[PDB]
Design a protein around this ligand. Structure first.
Ligand SMILES: O=C([O-])CC(=O)C(=O)O
Ligand SMILES: [Mg+2]
Length: 484
């Protein structure tokens, strides 16, 4: 098959981390400078924003970062188990350190306030006391108890503003992506917390939210630079119950006068999406009737986000004629590897409804953890066996269709094999789905991606190495009849 790459640069879940902000707040400074109650308040707000309580024993590397009241050579990391090295590499690249061509970690800035937690330091101390000593000579200093910003599910490169989203969209397209799937985030709750003997920390939910003013900016800013761009707007209200039938979910799917069209594509999920991990959202029949009516009217092609088997059942039965009406080829995205529930409306009980059955998915994760060529091949087999009948049901009901696949970060080594073996038409990558890339230069072999564009370049590379063709935006538009 020929394939198109979808870039997904933002999503609902990951958060931006400012790597130039403090990453550790000592207890004695917070508790002993504010009243015990506003100290409980600041703490709660830090905790809301993902900061975690830590005991003494951490290490802090700090330069030019306080007011009155930086390399990691490859042989250092190579001295450790793969697991320990990966932990360090992921933590430091989350903090904006980068991997050099020699496979060293480098911080390429003057100031920094970068902290490693006691559990990491303890593990280093056990595997290599000499490394801990080398680190302390390099300036890593022992810490008291306090609060740490791990940046769990965070990236210093996540774009959350119209300007940054535009720039990443364009870079992703230039790295090879034909389609860009967009979310916006609500940043109205941003607030600066000042801490004496430390400085300012900025908190905020970065909550997933359709922001109309953001799209009013993004759509023409993208189109001015790349008029061929195929924009796929998220209609999801993930994280935000109580908005599931709101017209807000199509208000961004208007004709944009500055651009002379409605968005080319937008996401549509024709059943409730109930993540096993929590945070899902309904898509009721009355709401969906309104969505389809609207997509058809403005000329936006739905991309059916196939989260679960309920969606497969519904798309191929009740909603089939409506999907045909919104134009061929009908577009599908397999949200593979993400555990899903279906809830019985009568009893309220849930059962597995994942595309890859959770029990099978758990086996796949175990196999990928082996890091052996045999295990990888078994993992691919299990994935294909689970996904094959889903793909065939979709192909049978929609002879003129295009089916892509995504996978969560930790399963992404399967992406190309699974997509090629299923005869899929596309593959999606981006910070929405995973924050990492492989990098053979660095011990442990994994690090934070420099951007969605980097993930796009790498998947494009792997595809070309197996004799696949990569379609451009101009080609996808023409062949899928989009933007009319
Ligand atoms: O974009 C969509 O339609 C779905 C999505 O990102 C999510 O709910 O995780
Ligand atoms: Mg999305």
């Amino acid at each position: 098959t020929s394939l198109y790459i979808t870039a997904a640069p933002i999503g609902a879940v990951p958060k931006f981390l400012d790597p130039f902000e403090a990453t550790f707040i000592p207890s004695f400074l917070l508790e002993g400078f504010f009243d015990a109650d506003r100290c409980a308040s600041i703490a709660a707000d830090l905790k809301t924003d993902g900061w975690e309580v830590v005991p003494a024993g951490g290490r802090l590397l700090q330069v030019g970062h306080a007011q009155p009241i930086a390399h990691f050579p490859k042989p250092w990391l190579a001295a450790l188990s793969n697991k320990l090295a990966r932990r360090i590499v992921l933590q430091l690249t989350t903090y904006g350190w980068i991997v050099s061509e020699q496979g060293d970690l480098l911080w390429e800035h003057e100031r920094q306030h970068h902290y490693l937690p006691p559990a990491l330091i303890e593990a280093i101390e056990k595997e290599s006391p000499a490394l801990l000593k080398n680190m302390e000579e390099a300036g890593w200093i022992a810490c008291a108890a306090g609060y740490w910003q791990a940046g769990k599910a965070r990236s210093p490169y996540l774009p959350i503003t119209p300007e940054a989203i535009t720039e990443e969209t364009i870079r992703s397209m230039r790295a090879g992506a034909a389609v860009v799937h967009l979310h916006t985030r609500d940043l109205s709750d941003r607030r600066r917390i000042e801490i004496p003997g430390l400085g300012v920390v900025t908190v905020g939910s970065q909550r997933n939210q359709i922001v109309l003013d953001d799209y009013d900016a993004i759509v023409p800013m993208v189109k001015k630079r790349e008029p061929a761009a195929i924009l796929n707007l998220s209609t999801s209200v993930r994280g935000d119950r109580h908005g599931a039938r709101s017209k807000l979910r199509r208000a961004h799917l208007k004709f944009y006068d500055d651009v002379g069209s409605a968005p080319e594509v937008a996401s549509l999920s024709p059943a409730a999406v109930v993540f096993q991990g929590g945070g899902g959202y309904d898509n009721a029949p009355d709401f969906l009737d309104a969505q389809f009516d609207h997509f058809e009217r403005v000329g936006t092609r739905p991309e059916v986000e196939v989260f679960n088997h309920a969606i497969v059942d519904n798309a191929t039965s009740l909603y089939r004629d409506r999907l045909l009406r919104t134009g061929k080829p009908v577009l599908f995205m397999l949200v593979a590897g993400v555990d899903q529930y279906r809830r019985d409306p009568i009893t309220g009980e849930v059962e597995d409804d994942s595309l890859i059955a959770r029990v099978v998915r758990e086996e796949i994760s175990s196999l990928l953890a082996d890091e052996s060529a045999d295990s990888h091949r078994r993992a691919v087999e299990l994935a294909i066996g689970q996904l094959r009948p889903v793909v065939e049901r979709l192909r049978a009901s929609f002879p003129v269709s295009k089916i892509s696949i995504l996978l969560p970060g930790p399963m992404q080594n399967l992406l190309v094999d699974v997509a090629l073996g299923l005869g899929l038409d596309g593959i999606r990558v981006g910070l929405e789905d995973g924050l990492t890339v492989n990098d053979a230069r660095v011990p442990g072999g994994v690090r934070k991606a420099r951007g969605t564009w980097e993930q796009v370049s790498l998947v494009r590379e792997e595809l070309l190495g197996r004799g696949a063709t990569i379609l451009t935006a101009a080609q996808v538009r023409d062949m899928f009849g989009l933007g009319i």
